[PDB]
Design a protein around this ligand. Sequence first.
Ligand SMILES: Cc1cc2nc3c(=O)[nH]c(=O)nc-3n(C[C@H](O)[C@H](O)[C@H](O)COP(=O)(O)OP(=O)(O)OC[C@H]3O[C@@H](n4cnc5c(N)ncnc54)[C@H](O)[C@@H]3O)c2cc1C
Length: 449
Amino acid sequence: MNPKRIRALKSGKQGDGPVVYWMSRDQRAEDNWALLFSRAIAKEANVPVVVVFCLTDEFLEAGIRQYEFMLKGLQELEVSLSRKKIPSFFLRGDPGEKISRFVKDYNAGTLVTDFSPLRIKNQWIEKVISGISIPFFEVDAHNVVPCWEASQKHEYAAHTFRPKLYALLPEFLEEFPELEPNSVETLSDVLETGVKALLPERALLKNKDPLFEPWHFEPGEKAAKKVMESFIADRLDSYGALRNDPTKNMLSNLSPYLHFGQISSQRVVLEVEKAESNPGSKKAFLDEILIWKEISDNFCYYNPGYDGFESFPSWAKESLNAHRNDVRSHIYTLEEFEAGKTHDPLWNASQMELLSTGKMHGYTRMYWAKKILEWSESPEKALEIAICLNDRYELDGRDPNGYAGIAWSIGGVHDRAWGEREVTGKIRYMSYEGCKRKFDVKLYIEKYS
Ligand SMILES: Cc1cc2nc3c(=O)[nH]c(=O)nc-3n(C[C@H](O)[C@H](O)[C@H](O)COP(=O)(O)OP(=O)(O)OC[C@H]3O[C@@H](n4cnc5c(N)ncnc54)[C@H](O)[C@@H]3O)c2cc1C
């Protein structure tokens, strides 16, 4: 029950009513530090614990592909919490109004939320603390090491973040205690009206055939566990050598579950650590899910402008500024990028995989973002194009990994300077020819036509 995982957002008079767990980022019942800590206060105050989820008005900025995935998991989560005698209340509207009224109407004793370094979450918090007088607590249930404890400042590179995080692993990498059970309407109806409001925004092909294919990733806490088990048994050993090959589905495919909190990253690392495998494959995977995933939270926590040109490293800002007026080979607008109407078939295939499956391969994701910088009027124009496309079509989008990853590809955050080139300056450059020497670009293109 390590107290380093919890910050105090605002102190106040401890109410005599139930502890309310405001669930935003970690939509699961198993392996949830925020859920288990909320139960701890409930036992200490002789009072039950309840869970509240807010359905905000920002869902219309994304597609149905993310709406049903989240809502389907919440339907499963509702059953799980009822098995432990924990009621779950689902509210519609924005949290600033909804959380304040629910606390007043229920006389909540303590308010607990999970941690997210995103700008929108801080916006919701700022409205909440100005509407309640009960204590407000928040718990990092997303990172193995708490984000404010891994580092106290912005980390310039992964090689400076790795020694700090690994030094704290023996303390924070621990098992999850069991969620002991306890001593504003239906979920299906909200789904019904949600798609009806989103249906005009459906991504469609020429013949009005829906582009999205929902059979690639089943949502829910249960489906996440099988994916983790399938990756360890079947794909973990080849991960070290085939993670850069989009033609092979050797990735873990855990990101849609990780983003929604349907599976805990600590559970993944615990299971991978005791599994016996090729030694590189374990280290390569551990680097992504521990170093790179949790440095993405660090990037968003300590940079208020994580989605802006201002948060780029000084060398990258100077190089891109010096190459701002360089004539670009081609310029594409947002619609051409969206529908895949560029001269690059490799980029077009990556966009089609994104539009069809909702999860573009990690290696082609780097190629996809860097070509936006090459084919945009300004680095700022490419930054918003990349963010707009990523948050709209990726199942794992609107995530700290997304903004950190875009910043890495476009602004070279958590990277070093490379050879000076036109337009892109010293930013790491990936070429169509270089991709051909790494993997078979042909079979990747045919698969997504
Ligand atoms: C431009 C760009 C945008 C991205 N947008 C997102 C996004 O919106 N959401 C998202 O979850 N990831 C994003 N990624 C990070 C990475 O692409 C995905 O985490 C990864 O592709 C997810 O597929 P996987 O789980 O099967 O890969 P795996 O090889 O299995 O990786 C395992 C886990 O490690 C983490 N991870 C892996 N690679 C990275 C990385 N480069 N940075 C941070 N964490 C990583 C992920 O949590 C991942 O689930 C982005 C990467 C780039 C370059």
